[model samples]
Target: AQNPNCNIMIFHPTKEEFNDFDKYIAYMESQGAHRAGLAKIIPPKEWKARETYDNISEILIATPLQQVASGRAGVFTQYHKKKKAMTVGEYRHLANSKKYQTPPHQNFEDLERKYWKNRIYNSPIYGADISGSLFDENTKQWNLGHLGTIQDLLEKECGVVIEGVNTPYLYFGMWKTTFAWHTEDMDLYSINYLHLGEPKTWYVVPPEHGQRLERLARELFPGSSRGCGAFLRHKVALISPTVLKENGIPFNRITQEAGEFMVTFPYGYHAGFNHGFNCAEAINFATPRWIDYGKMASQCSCGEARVTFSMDAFVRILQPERYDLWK
Candidate 1:
């Protein structure tokens, strides 16, 4: 019943394969993996999972969790009617508990009809800048910041650090915690490494289907999309794969387990939920080819829209060296 070729590409790359990561990405992109908009890579078995979350257990904050079952909009809208104060350790305990693990409803239709109602909290701690704190100098290869593909050609060529874009952000997730559908900042490539956790389920639509997804989203939420061209940036919309498939949009699903890396291509629209307590790190990067996409993003930003970084500054800085030939 499935289009076999549409499955998200999974590569089990050896340690040596990552020596020239950009080259490997180009190879994968050439082979139409980009059409799926996302790919998963399993590092060699020798690369053991790191115990990075142990020390941060005591961190407490008023975390917001989406009240999926409480709202009329249900899973379609990102609503956080409930906020709870808990330590990371306490949240982890709850996430691993049998109560949280149990499904609220057995049938998919019933779950949807119930608006995916669950007592389990969907709180995901996002955007913790852990670039320097998480990785040591020795683990450069496994480090999200140091990866060749995400090595940021702009930073390499122009010598400027765009804080959030180049730096790795850590995410802490529990059961059912979701990241809504959106593309990477400035439409650049993004790579996420699951340092340790239960598998994450990712649904991605190809870049070609980006507009189709947007059109569907606009129809679904007309009030939000009316004035905002970049409505997806709000990160409030969440649609099921079943809905996307029924609407004639092509998509791929992949399970990203511990020690695995998921890469999203330029302008790839992706969203997903966590299976259980997990820690992941993600960062955006750009190759020489990303210039056009960055330029387009810069031009599209209207009055109040936030621009991540200045594409004009990047091009201007790189212009003097005439590095276009080298790239």
Candidate 2:
């Protein structure tokens, strides 16, 4: 119960697999030309593809100072500085118009020496360390008092022994110039370390009871069973194209993996999606406040659950859809 409100947003970057680029190209090649247009360069081969995009993070890190910087992605990086609360216009004038060859990386902290050093080149090497995303290395002990300000809040209010917390920006991608989708994977499959191919995205919409179960009782099964259904929303980044077309739920022309999202029921009616893009995983396991009651409801297909919320002459109760067995 210590510091019940301090959730953290940790970005743990690692050395690019180099093989990952190969995997992307190969996977796309296997999936066919829907990627040919997106990849720009033809699949370079078993070796080159591995290293070709290896420095993407590096290029992206140095983009602000690079004259060869392109659009969208470049603008995106500059936007990042603006978000870090840096003055973008001033940053641009200093990085572009000035004579400096690169922007200094200063996020690294050498706690023992109270010293900090950053690379001055486009290489994303902070003393041989590659960079990408944020990840807190804290194990099971978290201060929950910091949730609203960061990921730590989930712990403060979730009443669960959390294995981790994340911001969900990891593997996600831009949708029609905006990113509203987010991914969250609980600690169910963490012990395995996910050393290989991508996991399937499990689309889900949780029930309200699940929230109560987490707080008042303890159940995880009912909510956890909402596993992958292997259904892809073609030409759309959102849900049930058929249902959306029938109901006007905004969709998209681009496709995103669904395995990433899991809505918190009763808590909120939010839907889930893949962390998308390069996002590898989400906050890992924590013994939650509930058992698995919601998983039961989630696993059950859409069926009539005895509807009774109706009014007869505004005085008597009436059934909306489900009829009583006695009747």
Candidate 3:
């Protein structure tokens, strides 16, 4: 049964939408966004995708992975490193490149001749541990995830801390490359900008339902003698959208356009695939509400920890600082 009133939201490109930033943030922070919903921020008409890409391309950035066979060209990839996955050391990109095809014998005619391409030859060579910067002081205001927006309580903000909390991750993506569903580390909010590229299709499952969805997965993949759940299997089957709908579980969809911004609220589960070649940048930031939320997430002790900063330490550091500010 389809939900008659799934209220996914879209913010337009106008002075009006920009002025409502605080209002929008309030809505997202509240239960509104966590109840099977999503939000997208569209850029102004004056903004051009290609121009932004050109500006970014001028700077030399180190890609985390490059093709070993096709020369050092940056393309699409899944960010997380799985301990036992095939991509563990391969650093494989997820696009439809010849290297990603299933089976060692899958033949592609290439419209003329069929060839069996070895997967090893198509593996990604690990590149730099760091990437290029997209944020500078003056431009910080333009980025929603910019620390300054939420850093009002702190008087000093440094860009280059050896261990920075909100450093932006720059990504290059191609068709079919996907990011699986997950929320920001410790349930903090995140903003991702498709700086320039073909659109990406985002599937968002609001936080309130994310837990239910996992429970449903557990049921679908019942526990075994060894106590391993189906969902915990190495090759768990896809959780079909149809299956979700039949169960009356609602989810929101967003085809994020070029130059658009996708903002995920705290605890909201979001995942997506790139339509074609493109570049994007993403980072995380937090508001006051995250203090309690962070403490709870630290206690969960499940899933891989992706937070650049320790949530417990952050709360400890901020509590005294907040006490001082009040004084």
Candidate 4:
């Protein structure tokens, strides 16, 4: 809590600030892409809207329990990864679970600094996304916060629809539940909204500095090259700002308060840890500016093939409409 503020910018947008949706989109782009800031936007209307949904905190704990109570088989699992499934609804009682729950008061900032140095690190959890297309049998729907995200606007205007590719994934994270360092899919932008719970801490390497950290990662992990390169894989190792700053690669830190939106721009490497039990939702989407980078990322090991498919669809459908603008 005593750390100095880095580059994460906090913007409190009143109703007047977001009068123009496209203007707000450009403002977010300036903050995220141009300045490479982890933009935390708190909208006045959205905050009021958040009061619904049981404020999201209560919903996190109640959703799965209620689902399991209905005798839903295999709805919850004790294991973090695959296989060795426990009996139905085993996640409700996590005593035998692989995901270790830390004391709620534990100060992960200091604890993680002393974490394993030589071994690979990852947090275990029984996380699940409820109330999305990805989730099965979820009858609940989230209200659109007064100031909807830029991701929403792009989807409406893009004219190319790719379902599930940009769907929001909700999370119920236990203390020290972690996500390792990595950028967004196809180097696109992602926005993580902390609906409610203990604040999540994030470490970010600005887009300009990502490649330097990538090189450093190669030096630190030999196993990364054994496969399709380290940065290309889904789960990246925990990287320290201490290491990055020591090597002259600029890094930033941010602690995301509940209701704050954390924006991760293209190639802005990021990782996070939940302070305690919390609920959050995240989604990834592309802007017109992302087209060039998305195309380039599609050729990389990390990018999804669907990125090309989505762009191809967008261009085929939209380009014909704009043929007069080309010549």
Candidate 5:
């Protein structure tokens, strides 16, 4: 069952497969890469407007499992109680503001913009919040902040090593607000830790396993997959969201009870599902708390309009091996 949903995704050697941490670093550089972009922007373009509809399961089916999960079962149990068994319309409506409730109250768009102003990059779609870091003038372009934040988290948090890495601004939420789709975001391992809310339907598409699953799906369930990835549902898949049927792999399954997990996400095509709600206060542990500001402000919520002028870019830290490279 290593190749569930039949996907074939690329992969690199893990630390266990290597002799020492040094070799892991070498392997990362050899295989590490840019962060994956939205599936709507890549192959099988139907994925572009997935969120507008109700059941976006098809478009969002390839997120890395390790990149998402609840750290405790308590979080999920509470979430399911309020969510499960509800109609998709009801679920989305709840996630959506009363904007269309006939007497709209802070419509979703206004709410989304407000959150962005706070620098809560956890956009339900592409995590566009992080994309803000890449902006130079009025448009959104990948920025050093995105590359820098991620680089530091990899090195400092996970003990991974890399050279000339950039920081990444991230967007996170309680459950499936993060989309699901195979991604080539960064050749280095990605991570997630649940602070609150229910368990997420995390997905993964390891290349080795994907190779096996895709062949099976194509032979058995023709006209089934949304595109490059096939959809495999997970309660808290922990890590089984990869729909990139080609050369994909399924690693772990963090449920409402899972504590933590992580792996590399190719920086090219992964996607996510919008939990469609304001995330219960959480922080991206990948960046330094001080942000080089010496007792800086909280990264929790900054507010709209004010956020445009904000410069609280999540900075990167030193990879353990190259501890000397960081300040």
Candidate 6:
């Protein structure tokens, strides 16, 4: 029962088109690309290959194991609460180890039981302030910090480095490593570049269906939804696409490969799991239209608690002469 509408849009941009980030994004939006909530951008072949830093081998971080087999329908629960600290190299070795490999199962139940017993860990170094570690900021094409409208406006206007939002954060993923359904902070757009390894699968719900997704999430997790309007921001819940389709919520799925970029639109609800070992970097960005979304985000019950930067200050700096109107 494949839905024809479930395919996300993919763009193949030339070197010149991709280099002019602002114009390219605007052109895509004008063509209604944002309606799908996610788009894959394939850059020209000449784009420089991202390198793995030697320092990554020695840096240690705590990684969480997700019980993905239980994620189907009514049985899904939060990720394993316990975390295991390991070096990036050690985690990569373990992730690629044959012990965690999936074997044939007689049925879905058997598969679930086996996966539940042998959970896989997601070694995500999220929001890492890797200022001078991996990338050279002068390389505008591969640098997430310098690309898109946010760098021109938000970064220049604010004059501050907001880690993970303006600055990029690195991620390391393995099979069944899941990122739960959620929107970017302040509902800003997010761009993820898969530097290498196996493709990651993404499920995105358009901005129009965002509220419906939230409603469904609330219905599914009443206790967590209690008091908090933006409970999904907590990033603890996982819902299958089958459930979403059954409930008449539209969603699109996309596979992101190495050297490609996945952009999630503002207010879009997205969730996905990695296919295998891969490294990616992501950062949040904003267009002029994001101000409205940011305003709406501020109204959530979570309030200013989750705001990474001051919207008021941003508006003032972005338009000093017309700040009163924005106020």
| Error of model 6, residue 87, in angstroms | 1.7
CA lDDT scores, all candidates in order: 0.65, 0.22, 0.49, 0.53, 0.29, 0.66
The count of backbone overlaps in candidate 6 is 0
lDDT of 1 at 156: 70
lDDT of 6 by residue, 32-73 (tens): 778888988888877764544445667554554534334444
Which pairs clash inside model 4?
none
What value does the lDDT take at residue 86 in candidate 2? 24
TM-score of each: 0.76, 0.21, 0.61, 0.66, 0.29, 0.76
**Model 4, 1-327: lDDT tens per residue?**
211233667777776774564476577566543345366777665334233453222333223321111111111111134323332134424522445455423565665553323112333453654544222232122222223443454566564444232346677665545566677655777767776666788878767667887887676655544454534344436555666667787787768877666767677778766665566777665566766555445222434223433444433443444323322
Please tell me which model should have the higher lDDT, number 4 or number 6: 6
Q: lDDT tens string, model 3, 1-327?
A: 232354666656554455445465665545354445457777666543333333443443333444222211111112333222222123323443564433332222220111112211343322222344454444423454344433432223323123233466666665434464556665677777776646667777766667776666565545421253222222212343555677775687657867777777777766555555566777666666655555454222222333234344454454445334524
Q: State the local distance difference test value for candidate 6.
A: 0.66
Q: After superposition, how far is residue 22 of candidate 2 from its true place, in Å?
A: 40
Best by lDDT: 6
Q: Which tens-of-lDDT digit does each residue in 166-242 have in candidate 5? A: 33343334223544333322122343322223333333334334445445444433333333232222122112222
Query: How much does each candidate deviate from the true structure in C-alpha RMSD?
Result: 6.2, 22.3, 10.0, 9.5, 19.6, 6.2
Q: Which sections of candidate 2 miss by over 4 Å? A: 1-56, 59-133, 136-169, 175-206, 209-237, 240-281, 284-287, 294-327
* Colliding residue pairs in candidate 3: none
Give the Cα-based TM-score of candidate 4 against the true structure: 0.66
Q: Where does the lowest 10-residue lDDT sum fall in candidate 1?
A: 119-128
